Amino acid sequence: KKSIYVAYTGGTIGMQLALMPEFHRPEMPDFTIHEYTPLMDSSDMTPEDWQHIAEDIKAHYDDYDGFVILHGTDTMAYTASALSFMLENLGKPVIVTGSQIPLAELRSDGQINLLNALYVAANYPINEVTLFFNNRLYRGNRTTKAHADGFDAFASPNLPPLLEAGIHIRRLNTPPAPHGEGELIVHPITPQPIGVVTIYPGISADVVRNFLRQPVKALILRSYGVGNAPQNKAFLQELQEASDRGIVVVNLTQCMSGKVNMALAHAGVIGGADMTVEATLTKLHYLLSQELDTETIRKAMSQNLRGELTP
Amino acid sequence: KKSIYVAYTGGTIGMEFHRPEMPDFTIHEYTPLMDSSDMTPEDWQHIAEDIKAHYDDYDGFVILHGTDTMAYTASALSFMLENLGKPVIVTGSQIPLAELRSDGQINLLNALYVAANYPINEVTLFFNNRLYRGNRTTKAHADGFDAFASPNLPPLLEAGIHIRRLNTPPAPHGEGELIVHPITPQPIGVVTIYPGISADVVRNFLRQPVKALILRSYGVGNAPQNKAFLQELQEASDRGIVVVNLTQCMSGKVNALAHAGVIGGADMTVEATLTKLHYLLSQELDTETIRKAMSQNLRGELTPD
Amino acid sequence: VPRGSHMQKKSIYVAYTGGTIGMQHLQRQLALMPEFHRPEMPDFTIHEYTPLMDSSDMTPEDWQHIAEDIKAHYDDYDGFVILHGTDTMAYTASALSFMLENLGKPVIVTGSQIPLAELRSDGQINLLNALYVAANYPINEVTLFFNNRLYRGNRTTKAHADGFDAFASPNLPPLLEAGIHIRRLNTPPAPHGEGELIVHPITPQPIGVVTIYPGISADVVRNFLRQPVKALILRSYGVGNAPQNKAFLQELQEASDRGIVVVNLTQCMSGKVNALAHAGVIGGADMTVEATLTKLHYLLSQELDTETIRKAMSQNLRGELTPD
Amino acid sequence: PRGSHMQKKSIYVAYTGGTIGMSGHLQRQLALMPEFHRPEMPDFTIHEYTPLMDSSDMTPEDWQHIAEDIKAHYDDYDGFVILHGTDTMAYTASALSFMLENLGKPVIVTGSQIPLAELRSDGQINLLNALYVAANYPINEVTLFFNNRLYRGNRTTKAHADGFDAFASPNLPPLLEAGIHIRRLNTPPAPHGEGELIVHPITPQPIGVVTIYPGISADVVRNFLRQPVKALILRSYGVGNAPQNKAFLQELQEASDRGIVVVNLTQCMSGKVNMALAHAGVIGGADMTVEATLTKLHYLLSQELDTETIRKAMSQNLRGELTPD
Ligand SMILES: NC(=O)C[C@H](N)C(=O)O
Ligand SMILES: NC(=O)C[C@H](N)C(=O)O
Ligand SMILES: NC(=O)C[C@H](N)C(=O)O
Ligand SMILES: NC(=O)C[C@H](N)C(=O)O
Ligand SMILES: [Cl-]
Ligand SMILES: [Cl-]
Ligand SMILES: [Cl-]
Ligand SMILES: [Cl-]
Ligand SMILES: [Cl-]
Ligand SMILES: [Cl-]
Ligand SMILES: [Cl-]
Ligand SMILES: [Cl-]
Ligand SMILES: [Cl-]
Ligand SMILES: [Cl-]
């Protein structure tokens, strides 16, 4: 019989398991729930909350066959993405899930997403940080909350799911992530000021100038299509002035799906390929927190570290 | 036999047509031709005034446009055109008409044919066999022929062996003389909510007099409750800045921030919200009238409660 | 979809006909699940059929049995949930739409891909949603609830044998979608009568279902004509195309001349049927096989001449087809 | 595979008929369309069939005609596009996959929902893409190209009679998707032999296609047992269920007794049969389409094999048409 650790970090799902007979069925793994203190709305999470969860998995790693992280949907994809970088040589499944309706409210999805995450962690283990939602397991660092009001809340726009649940559970033929074998390594992080700039008609040089001020180590650009911005010379020079001061400037697509393929490149900007804002932001927290020079971080942002981008 | 006007504004498309089932059409090549990534809000104005000049002498309008900001233009034209009595269809291509496997020919042919034969008196975006309400569109798929989505509204029309109008609820629609609303430059900020965002971002925009702030918030419109954040946002509204709360999510409806003077943008796209703000800021309306108008369905861009 | 008052506590009748949901006791499982008993949920009464059936073993007589059950309890409840096996859920939902006229209360067919007894069951959530919908969104048609969508019954088929999304409505959007909120879609209404519920009964009808496939001969239509048939459904290619060889077209004209109702459908999941006409074949527009088979059982069970049935097959009686 | 672009390829186009051409009209239309003659496009040769056929009128003999045409021209060209009516495109693609052993060159079936000669035709783009894919992405399978996707032929059905997205592959992802770039998908390969192309004959075989539906009688299986059956395809419910009626199960057991190959499929668009009918001699068709199962039976019944060998072969993945357990 497998044993699954459940980190109950907060979220809708919690806003009871004993009174439901399905959970204690013989076919289920054993599981234990740790209720965090305090419980958090995932809208209130900081990057240090990613650290608390990573260290909680680290404490429990040896004594469980897998890990379920119960979490608010608002930032679930950021947490999943962060854990993927912070965990290295992961040898057990870590599945983040939650609910769009609280377990306490009628028609809650919370019971069914938790039961599925527990069953899948035990019986179809995949040694990656994954996100289970509405009968699909996704690579955590490929996810976004796409549908604010839907039970199918999460998408994986640039990658098929890893696993689908119907009458049976099927592992899909999705290409595996680069995967280290060895001792689990858990990478701590420390606060990093990062700006997120959306490219839109009538954006000014002033925005890039503002972030440069004193307080930012990296800039994420949400640019058009395959990575275009207006060719405004003030804008470009601001971006060059950013990279000249060692700021890591990364070009993403504002589009739900697709790949940046770039100039901005002349202005020191690094392409983020098909990375989500969630993967890019967390990967920056990860790399900035390490003993790495600006140029090594700039190189690593465009490489596939944990399956978050297509080379 | 219908006559369709084609504004060739630029874009990928330019970097069977004359056979008898087709409408007559005329192409106006803009000077200069523009990559849509280079568009400013004054380019929306130039297109609206071009449609105004040609309105009386054509049965419909096709706007040829780069894909990068097609949804922004479509969205802007929907506000700027009032009491529209003929179809305005924005389209283009993911591959240049000049490159192999181009979608340009089939998107243009379709847009001309639909403008002539299935007119809908709205600013629409035709792409990959679907017609969408312009102010509901986003470029969702950077690399795909199905480049555009309408996440919170079904398409108005779909083309197969036959073309059918779908049963999509009609937009609020004025009858009367076409009114074309000019716009003038408006400084507007777009803030994405994410873990570890600082009050300084809102402090920065408050100090470089922006007239409006769009928040891309979590889920149904949540942000972290950090008192410094909420305070800077309140300071912005105190100074008369229009702060509108949208979902960063592809689909759904926004539902403390309110206490801080922030307005709910319901299920509006960033494209709709930004262009609506250009439109309303450009008219001579109180901040309070602008704040109430942002949450009202002016042209079919949002789903009322 | 009407948004019905929640003011008073509703009473829903549950016809537990059989199906996966109750296999391994249903009533005891539901007694033990607190969500079913909350103040926001309607009161409900379960009639367990004797015997319980695997929906694979259902005959038209079972359609008749369920319609009589609804008629018997119609004045006494606010709505009806038919718990049913998935395998023929779409044929039952299609048959009820034709057999019930002047329907002034919801009838919702639902079930599960996995038994309530088994692990990872969809039965709890499909039945909870059906009950809640029947109470609060009382659409006066026979509908099918599965996987957070309410569908027009006579537009459904089981499209996904292994999926929790088992049912599709290929030629009509859903009536309603469930998320954080329950959203009514603006799908236009079916024809509606007025007054007390009328059940149009059925009696056995021999009906053949021919698939058109390359190498099918005129001896197939001759074989169906050979003893047991009053109607032939053709699952034709694309928009209603069949071999145009004279033997095949003669065989069909001979069938129609003997008063066999021949109906041309697409074998395709979606689309609309647009020679065969001159051979007496009637176009079934965008109808499913489930809608067409059940419509024929309804129409053939009435004292109608062949011409009247032919005409009625191409007409939208209950929302099952899209008129030109 | 992403094939080399170094030498100008030569693609043979079998113009069998279909919506695309509705003599000399196709070939003249393509002459007049500059897209087709650019440097980046392969050279191509059109063989226009006489007569051209509506795909609705196709029989197994037509599958054989097309297979002989490919074999006759195999060494002379780098690849084959089969231009075909949509109505039975999926039956032809499925039949070729079984008939063509040691296939070392792409064969791509395509066509159009709207004639090249009409307005808003999809024929231009489906055929241009097919040619360009055959030359540059030379997958050694019978494939079907429609609406920017390349599918495994023996996994397809015409799902959408009115849509430009007419074809689906309900149980297998596409092999390739076309956008700004051409993306190859992770889809695992079919079994492949080695050496010269071998064409297995497919002949006429009396095969019945039974839809299971409430009220179906034993008389249907008795009817088919009259003559037109060496094989019977059951379109059963869900994961392969049928009524438990003793007479029904008797007639099926009787058929398998008389050497009739009885194969159980789902009537559902997607999913997999899971097998009683097994005790009645019925063979499970796993997740095969009717198109793959009809053509597989034509193939095996026309081969030098006994009833037992055909029954075993029907549940085996021969060409990528079936997902093994
Ligand atoms: N999660 C995401 O990154 C989706 C999209 N690329 C965006 O810019 O929001
Ligand atoms: N077009 C859009 O607005 C999509 C999504 N709401 C975003 O914030 O990018
Ligand atoms: N339910 C259906 O009718 C689907 C499809 N038209 C078929 O012939 O099976
Ligand atoms: N192509 C197919 O076989 C689809 C579906 N299984 C049918 O029975 O028609
Ligand atoms: Cl949503
Ligand atoms: Cl690793
Ligand atoms: Cl102007
Ligand atoms: Cl894309
Ligand atoms: Cl208006
Ligand atoms: Cl109630
Ligand atoms: Cl070539
Ligand atoms: Cl269709
Ligand atoms: Cl050899
Ligand atoms: Cl399935």
Author numbering:
A (entry chain C): 3 to 17, 34 to 280, 288 to 336
B (entry chain A): 3 to 17, 40 to 279, 288 to 337
C (entry chain D): -5 to 18, 30 to 279, 288 to 337
D (entry chain B): -4 to 17, 28 to 280, 288 to 337
Paper text:
L-asparaginases catalyze the hydrolysis of L-Asn to L-Asp. The genome of E. coli encodes three L-asparaginases, called type I, II, and isoaspartyl aminopeptidase/L-asparaginase, respectively. The active site pockets of these enzymes are shaped by two protomers, one of which forms most of the active site scaffold, including all catalytic residues; it will be referred to as a “major” protomer, with the second protomer called “minor”. Yet, as we demonstrated here based on the reinterpreted structures of EcAI and the new structures of EcAII, under some conditions a citrate ion can be accommodated into the active site cavity and even displace the canonical substrate or product.
The structure of the native EcAI was refined by Yun et al. with Refmac5 and a new version of the same program was used for the current re-refinement. Whereas the original model was missing part of the N-terminal hairpins consisting of residues 14–39 (with Thr14 modeled only in molecule A), we found that even the starting maps had some indications of rather weak density for a number of missing residues, indicating high flexibility. Although we modeled Thr14 with a covalently bound citrate anion in all four protomers, the corresponding mFo-DFc map for this residue and its ligand is completely featureless (indicating a very good fit) only for protomers A and B, each belonging to a different dimer of EcAI. The electron density was less contiguous in the case of protomers C and D, suggesting that Thr14 is more flexible in one protomer in each of the two dimers than in the other one. The structures of both the native enzyme and the T162A mutant are very similar near the mutation site, with the only consistent difference being the presence of a water molecule located between Thr14 OG1 and Gln272 O in the native enzyme, but not in the mutant. In crystals of EcAI (wt or T162A), C5-atom of citrate is covalently bound to Thr14(OG1), forming an acyl-enzyme moiety. Under the crystallization conditions (pH ~4) both the β1 and β2 carboxyl groups of citrate are predominantly protonated. The binding mode of such a citrate anion to the active site of EcAI mimics very closely the binding of a canonical substrate.
